[PDB]
Amino acid sequence: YAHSQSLDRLMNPLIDQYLYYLNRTQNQSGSAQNKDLLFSRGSPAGMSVQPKNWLPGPCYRQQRVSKTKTDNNNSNFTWTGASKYNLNGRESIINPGTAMASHK
Amino acid sequence: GADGVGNASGNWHCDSTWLGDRVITTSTRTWALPTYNNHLYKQISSASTGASNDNHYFGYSTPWGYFDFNRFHCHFSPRDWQRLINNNWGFRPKRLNFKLFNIQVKEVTTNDGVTTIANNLTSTVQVFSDSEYQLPYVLGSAHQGCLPPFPADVFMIPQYGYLTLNNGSQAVGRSSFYCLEYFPSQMLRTGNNFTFSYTFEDVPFHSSYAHSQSLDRLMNPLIDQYLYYLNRTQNQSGSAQNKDLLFSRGSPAGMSVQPKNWLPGPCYRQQRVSKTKTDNNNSNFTWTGASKYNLNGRESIINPGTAMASHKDDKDKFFPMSGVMIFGKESAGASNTALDNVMITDEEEIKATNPVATERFGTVAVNLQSSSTDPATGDVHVMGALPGMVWQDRDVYLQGPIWAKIPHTDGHFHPSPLMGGFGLKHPPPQILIKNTPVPANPPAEFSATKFASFITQYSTGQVSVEIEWELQKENSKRWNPEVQYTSNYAKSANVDFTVDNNGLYTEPRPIGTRYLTRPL
Amino acid sequence: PLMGGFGLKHPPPQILIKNTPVPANPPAEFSATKFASFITQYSTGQVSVEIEWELQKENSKRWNPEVQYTSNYAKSANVDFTVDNNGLYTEPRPIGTRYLTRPL
């Protein structure tokens, strides 16, 4: 199956949270810049900032590659700049690696 | 159950009863249900809004309201919460009992400012529970609209809406649209009532204790180890400096160097922030320099993050910028509001096993030392799971949430919801409610076009929730008294957790659970 | 009790009553702020109390008549403990209990 929801978009788009976070650390009074600590409560407007319960899957990053040759850096980096592991002196490329989305 | 119009379909059960290893909480509140979205499902998104790649969203809003009691103060009174906290090493939910009754459907006509409400007796309200978990679950997001902590407080029912898959402001093929009328639901007139029960799965006890030892200080202060370590790599013979390899056995003198059996909890570092504005770097770094995660192109701030101690030592003036629980304050506002109008939670008792959130986890060797190259040392700011690690989870608070639905995934790890509480594969289901549409007079000739003329109406009833909590009693051989949550004996203008002259219930501070002490 | 009567460790308990709050029509959009709009209403009913009193009868060997509470036989504008032309109930004087006589 495929999820019809995404981990970051799990809340109720219609309701605020009863939770707060530190929104501004510098207030705008026309005073150019002036310290301060300002908090706001979670809003549908600012989903990226609302407290949440879970984290996305583990990660071991991999080098990007384009299907159209043009986009790609010149040179032979298949081994040179590929993610790999070091077992008793010898390296082996992490091939299918940790399960990660292929392209955004 | 069901009996005429002039017959109450349920009583006011609001109580708590203590039974050795159990406690039963029972709450009743009066509620009010508006007719949402004028009976309509609406497509909603971030399109033609302020945008921001990290804030885009696609979803729908339903004509349906929903019940929410996922908050400890929905069940425990302050006094109770005190009892719970001061005497119990742990606790958890077992059984749940939900009753809905005394339904009253009012119709309101409003003619020239003169707005009058009457009883529509034959009108019906629909309710049903998502027992099969086929609706997007919103309860585990710390939203508003729970049962009021104060029993005498009437409340408004939250509107139900949900988010599906979005490619910024746009939906995809695999995006899901759910119609709540495509569920069987029970219809109620004024004399009817709805009831329902649930049993919690086996979740571990919330740890309402604090350790009276710390992971590093677990040995016998009086005795040497039979283990050795490399103490000096350069001897002092007055020869300035001269290689050498010197080993010593673990001693009480040098505890920081003794071999040990365990590691502190995982770590994902957060930026420090002072409560007194002065100490803070100038500039607006709340987003700019906040720890966050990157999910399909969009970033989201790791809010309550991995469970870490809030501030080291005495420095109670600091706190992780987005790594603690911040509560409203009744008089607090939307988005302005200063530190004086909020309450920040101090996760202090967990210092004994967990890394401090603002500081680093530790330090790692980063190169292969030798005669010709100096030994190097890197700082480690992010630390994943390690065989031998142990830790506590974030505490829970009287104004805090109780449980959250473990997402249905091919895999998860120590699924304690990150805001604190109980992680349930099958949580108390969502109870959906809704006023049934009552059409106004239609045309005297048939018309296929959608119906738009509705008699406007709302509803009121009582709701009762009863929960059975299993306690884990304390078995301490500690000789000295323990720390307890207490009220300040001294005189005062106001009494903690009461109403003021204007009759507004107010909660002084957040209260955690970890007062009693178990050894490690 | 110093004002006179029966001192009870567990007296007839307090009977608390109250009209149940009936909200007026709420906003067409959700609001977390405390609810303030109530349909104003009151209530009427009858109440009945029934009490069983144990008497301790008199066992007197006194020869001469006793003092009794009596109403004045003589003519009068008003009858003790009644209503007036305006329909107002009125209690002429206080009446204690101690009329019959027991020896010490």
Assembly form of the protein:
part of a larger assembly
Largest sheet of chain A: 2 strands, antiparallel
- Bulk shape of chain A: elongated
Instruction: Assign the structural class of chain A, choosing from mainly alpha, mainly beta, alpha/beta, alpha+beta, or little secondary structure.
Output: mainly beta
Instruction: Please write the string of helix (H) and strand (E) elements of chain A.
Output: EEEE
Quick synopsis:
The structure is cut from a larger assembly and holds 3 copies of chain A. Chain A has 104 residues and is an all-beta fold.
Topology readout:
This is part of a larger assembly, with 3 copies of chain A.
Chain A: E1 19-24, E2 38-41, E3 84-87, E4 90-93
PDB class: virus
Keywords: beta barrel, virus
Entry title: Structure-function Analysis of Receptor-binding in Adeno-Associated Virus Serotype 6 (AAV-6)
Structure commentary:
Chain C: It comes from Adeno-associated virus 6 (AAV6). Chain C: It is found in: Virion. Chain C: This is Capsid protein VP1. The structure is cut from a larger assembly and holds 3 copies of chain A. Chain A is mostly beta strands. Helix content of chain A is about 0%, strand content about 15%. Chain A has no helices and 4 strands. In chain A, the strands form 2 sheets. The first copy, chain A, has a two-stranded antiparallel sheet. The first copy, chain A, has a two-stranded antiparallel sheet with strand order 3-4. In chain A, a hairpin with a 2-residue loop joins strand 3 (about 85) and strand 4 (about 90-95). The two termini of chain A are about 20 Å apart. At the A-B interface, strand 1 and strand 2 of A face strand 9, strand 18, strand 19 and strand 21 of B. Strand 1 (about 20-25) of chain A pairs antiparallel with strand 21 of chain B, so a sheet runs across the interface.
